[PDB]
RNA sequence: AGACCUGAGUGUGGCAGGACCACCCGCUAAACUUAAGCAUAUUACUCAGCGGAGGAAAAGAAAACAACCGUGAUUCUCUCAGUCAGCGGCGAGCGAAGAGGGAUUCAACUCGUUGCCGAAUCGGGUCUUAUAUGACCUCGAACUGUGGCA
RNA sequence: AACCCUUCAUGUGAGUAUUGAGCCAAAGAAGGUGUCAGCCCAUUACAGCCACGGAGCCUACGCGCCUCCUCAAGAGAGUAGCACUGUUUGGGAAUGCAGUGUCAAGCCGGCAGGUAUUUGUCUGCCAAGGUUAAAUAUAGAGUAGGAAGACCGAUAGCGAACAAGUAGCGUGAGCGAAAGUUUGAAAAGUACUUUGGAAAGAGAGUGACAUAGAACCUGAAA
RNA sequence: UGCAGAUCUUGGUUGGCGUAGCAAAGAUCUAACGGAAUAUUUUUAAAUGCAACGUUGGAUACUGGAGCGGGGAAGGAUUUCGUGCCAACGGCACUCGUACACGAGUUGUUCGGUCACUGAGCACAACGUUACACCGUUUUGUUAGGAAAGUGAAGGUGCUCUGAAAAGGGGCAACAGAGAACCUGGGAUGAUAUUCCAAAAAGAAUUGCAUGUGGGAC
RNA sequence: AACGUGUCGCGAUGGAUGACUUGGCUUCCUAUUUCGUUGAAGAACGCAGCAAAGUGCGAUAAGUGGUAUCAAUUGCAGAAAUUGCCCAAUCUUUGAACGCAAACGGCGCAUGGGAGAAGCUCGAGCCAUCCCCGUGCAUGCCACAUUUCUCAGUGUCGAA
């Protein structure tokens, strides 16, 4: 019953301390599951779990946000770790991108100019 | 004597399990697999065989990531 | 273009006390030694597939 | 997957015991089982009765 | 729009609809009071509404909706039930669109949605 | 006999572990169509070899 | 002792490998069958085999047609035409092209070479909100020629 | 209401059916609901209204500001050509190509002009380097969706309307089924009595119908 | 788009027929108990409930150590054990079962493998060939026109430089070859044991690493 | 006599026929429509309160997060969310599979962490041997050494 939105203020520290306390009922709960205990215990098995994986999300968001500010530095674009990368696919990584694509020579860049493209109409 | 007789004189096994393709087709004394060839690059895939080509082919499993990457695709890519 | 064919059959031929019509190959289905590619044949082609021109 | 070795170290933690020997074999259905033998100074017993036995 | 020219499309999308299409597709008219008071025709049917049976055997019959069974495509109506062999009395399904509204249960959620589908001019 | 990789030892376990019947509760479920396990498996009558 | 040439080791940043393969591009390549037999021929420059891409591929801007009162890159469609063109134990059989009516079409550009210049070019670093077609530096590459004009 | 007569008891499911009155239609559209439904439900529209929208594409080459930029010679060489051999083509004294040998011209050039050679005119083009949308294919492909059909209707149609490339077969390459859970509107799926070790039988009960009793519609022939 | 036959296809049914048979490996008997399987009659005891099943005791007899004895490899993979249970299956029978159902069981410093050897042999790298590697070479001391060693003897510095010598790339292939430090007892099980036993370890040992102290030397 | 034969009523055996159809086949159209070393396609093992197959998912395991809708799920529990769509994440052992191998859940080198019951220092700190975890380490090819790295050649020259 942690809920997400309570757990956005907390630190790291108070998360681990948190997140190492769910983890003992759920051993707890498997011990009574063996001693066939009523089923209202059963139900919290469910819930446990659930509070485990909130966590565990959180945790991994924030460390992937002070990555990301980290290697945010130019001149460090060439150490970033791929996985932190943008992953489109394996054919859009190596097309050539805008500023590549479009190039052009001084000689059309000249004619270009001399003569552009125009709308007339006729009668 | 080629008979019932000889079927008793059979002992060992030619083939075990293949690492790659999980088949019985794993020739122990070769080291060669019968079904996907491993541990060649390439596996088999023979025209003669439309049947066999349509058993192995894309679709035929779970398509783990091909899922994921068509549905990116369909959106382009959109992205926070 | 492909309904009623996609077998490997082939007719057992004369001498086994059986017609010549062609049969499946294998075993241990049910299917193994029933006649195919006939029209007159359970599972087999139809007598003049119709074309789409 | 675990070892003794691991094994002998988290029962330490998890239930504040001494053991002097650990047993391990894979059963026919693919689990682990084990038999930690503890201390003379520790109660079998009074440790099963603690969890819950 | 589920109906279409194709039957067979027609049907497959009706019998294989999700939770969410199913609430839609199971209700019931208001009555006349209650529709001179919204200047709405229909409304889907929720629990603890208070509906009568217009068609079929408990023909007059009213009571307090107790289960929307959308897997099943029926309700659950209080004091329309049935005796087991054993004496233990059933609950028995009833289609949606056999019974009218007598009663709303509101909150605001109810309350939007009745605005929403309100016929009204200005 | 005695000898076997473990992993031939873990595919024995799954097959084993499958040879199960129905559970009751399953054939009471709405729309249900199945009435028993049709791939139970005995080993005097089909052999898993491996 | 030091250059140039040729050749190694390591480090930093990148790429190739497999799958799919209906359609498309390159190679390799049969026989059953027909000829009432059969060897050239036919099936067929097809099936099987190997390699390689895309959303289409390939082709494409005249060392082209024609012989007229002349047309004007490529591709596709009707037709030319089962052809009083042609190939063939001249047997069985096989077999196109120009022209004409259309679909599409603001469709065309460029390197080397010749003449005038001769690092004005490329890589790396720093700055300008900027890995600028910008500026400055660079015993780095490049005169065995990168770029700019006709 | 079953050899005939008399007497006493039992038996008709659900109104989308019939009749009489109305109403809507810029909507009559074909699905659902216990029998055949425009008006019980969901649908049927813009002749529309809201949320989210990082990149990309389109719009007086959308629109401001700062920077930057701009406005006498020659023409592809182990190439083309030729000889031999092989293959290919409708290409026929040789259509294209490949291997080896030989190997150019450009102060009266080269290639083509469908019968071989030598010589002279005329006509059209200028090889041996490169890029390029649209109109075309999808003849056992994919990702999302739509339109359907004078098609098949469970031995048919895909092998597969179902836990089907599954069960099963083969050392292996490979081969490969059967099977509509179609009871009923609704499980209301037969409490209880009695015989029996049980399985079941004889009663009773639910349901309009149980000769609709559970792989249960209809239920033919041998 | 019309069926009587194609040694036609797929299902179902059928006389033969309660028939042919169920005849190698010698063989069972008796009392008590168990079981629904009896000692079952209304219309004296025999002539009206037959036949057959498991366990225990006793009898008889077989295997006859090249065994219907006790352990392993290949192959099989829960057939192992306890309790319950008889619809279908064990071509007769079952109360029995390797059947069905529900739960249980496999314990290692020293046993086998591996860490860690080579053999008949295999074929990554390198090179060459092929239109195309999915081809060839690769132990006669041994890859490759072939620069494949990344190790470090004496010596200097201090408490870390300089360099002698070493030809021939990297792997796999033996659960009967090479190699390998543990033995008995148990009242410790329903089922595992040279694997379990805890202070009088029932005990007695052997071996791999790290340490700290007592002693000989730097 | 019996067996046997025939007809009618009823009952068995069997699963045809008819009516049904969330399936197949064929043709046409529209897109911000075309995988992978940033580890694909395939293959294996696991995950639910009761869960064999199938479906979904991966030790965050019939799901975590966002958004729209607005009260269920349903066999029994159990509680007082579910459904559609999608940005943020997790993603076991393998496989082109790439540190070396492989009927082995085996064996390394470098680097950074963790636990630690002997020992040491004053109940804590430092923890030897043993053990666990993350990352890098195939081959080939291209560019660079931007503080211009280390070399080899009876190749061509060249000073003291
Ligand atoms: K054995
Ligand atoms: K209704
Ligand atoms: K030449
Ligand atoms: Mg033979
Ligand atoms: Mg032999
Ligand atoms: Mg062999
Ligand atoms: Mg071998
Ligand atoms: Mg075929
Ligand atoms: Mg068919
Ligand atoms: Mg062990
Ligand atoms: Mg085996
Ligand atoms: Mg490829
Ligand atoms: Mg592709
Ligand atoms: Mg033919
Ligand atoms: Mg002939
Ligand atoms: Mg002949
Ligand atoms: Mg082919
Ligand atoms: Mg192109
Ligand atoms: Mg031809
Ligand atoms: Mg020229
Ligand atoms: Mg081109
Ligand atoms: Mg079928
Ligand atoms: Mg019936
Ligand atoms: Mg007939
Ligand atoms: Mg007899
Ligand atoms: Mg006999
Ligand atoms: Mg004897
Ligand atoms: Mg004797
Ligand atoms: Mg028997
Ligand atoms: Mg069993
Ligand atoms: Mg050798
Ligand atoms: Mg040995
Ligand atoms: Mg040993
Ligand atoms: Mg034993
Ligand atoms: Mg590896
Ligand atoms: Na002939
Ligand atoms: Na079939
Ligand atoms: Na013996
Ligand atoms: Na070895
Ligand atoms: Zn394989």
């Known amino acids: ?123 | 004597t080629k008979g019932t007789t000889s079927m008793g004189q059979r002992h060992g096994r030619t083939h075990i399990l293949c690492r790659r393709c999980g088949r019985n087709a794993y020739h122990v004394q070769w080291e060669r697999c019968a079904a996907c060839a491993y541990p060649r690059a390439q596996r088999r895939r023979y025209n003669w065989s439309v049947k066999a080509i349509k058993r192995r082919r894309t679709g035929t499993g779970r398509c783990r990531y091909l899922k994921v990457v068509h549905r990116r695709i369909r959106n382009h890519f959109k992205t926070d | 273009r492909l309904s009623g064919m996609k077998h490997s059959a082939e007719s057992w031929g004369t001498g086994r006390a059986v017609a010549r019509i062609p049969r499946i190959h294998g075993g241990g289905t049910s299917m193994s030694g029933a006649g195919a590619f006939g029209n007159m044949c359970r599972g087999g082609r139809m007598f003049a597939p119709t074309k789409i021109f | 997957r675990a070892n003794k070795t691991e094994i002998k170290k988290a029962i330490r933690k998890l239930y504040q015991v001494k053991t002097v020997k650990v047993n391990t074999l894979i059963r026919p259905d693919g689990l682990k089982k084990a038999y930690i033998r503890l201390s003379a100074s520790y109660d079998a017993l009074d440790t099963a009765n603690k969890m819950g036995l | 729009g589920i109906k279409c020219r194709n039957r067979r499309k027609a049907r497959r999308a009706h019998f294989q609809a999700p939770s969410h299409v199913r609430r839609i597709l199971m209700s019931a008219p208001l009555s006349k009071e209650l529709r001179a008071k919204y200047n709405v025709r229909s409304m889907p049917v929720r629990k603890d509404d208070e509906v009568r049976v217009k068609r079929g055997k408990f023909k007059g019959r009213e009571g307090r909706v107790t289960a929307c069974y959308r897997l099943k495509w029926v309700i659950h109506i209080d004091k329309v039930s049935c005796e087991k062999a054993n004496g233990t009395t059933v609950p028995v399904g009833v289609h949606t669109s056999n019974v009218e509204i007598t009663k709303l249960k509101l909150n605001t959620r109810r309350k939007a949605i009745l605005e929403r589908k309100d016929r009204s001019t200005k | 006999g005695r000898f076997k990789p473990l992993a031939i030892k873990k595919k024995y376990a799954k097959k084993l572990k499958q040879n199960r019947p129905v559970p009751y509760w399953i054939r009471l479920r709405t729309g249900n169509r199945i009435k028993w396990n049709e791939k139970r498996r005995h080993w005097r009558r089909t052999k898993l070899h491996y």
């Open chain 1, 1 to 123: 019953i942690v809920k997400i939105r309570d757990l956005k203020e907390k630190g790291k520290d108070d998360l681990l301390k948190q997140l190492s306390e769910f983890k003992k009922e759920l051993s707890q709960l498997r011990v009574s599951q063996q001693m066939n205990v009523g089923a209202a215990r059963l139900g919290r098995i469910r819930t446990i779990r659930k509070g485990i994986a909130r966590i565990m999300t959180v945790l991994n968001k924030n460390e992937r946000e002070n990555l990301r500010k980290f290697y945010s530095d130019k001149k460090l674009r060439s150490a970033k770790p791929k996985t932190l990368r943008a992953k489109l696919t394996h054919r859009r990584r190596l097309a050539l991108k805008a500023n590549e694509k479009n190039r052009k020579t001084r000689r059309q860049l000249r004619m270009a100019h001399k003569f552009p493209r125009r709308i007339y109409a006729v009668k």
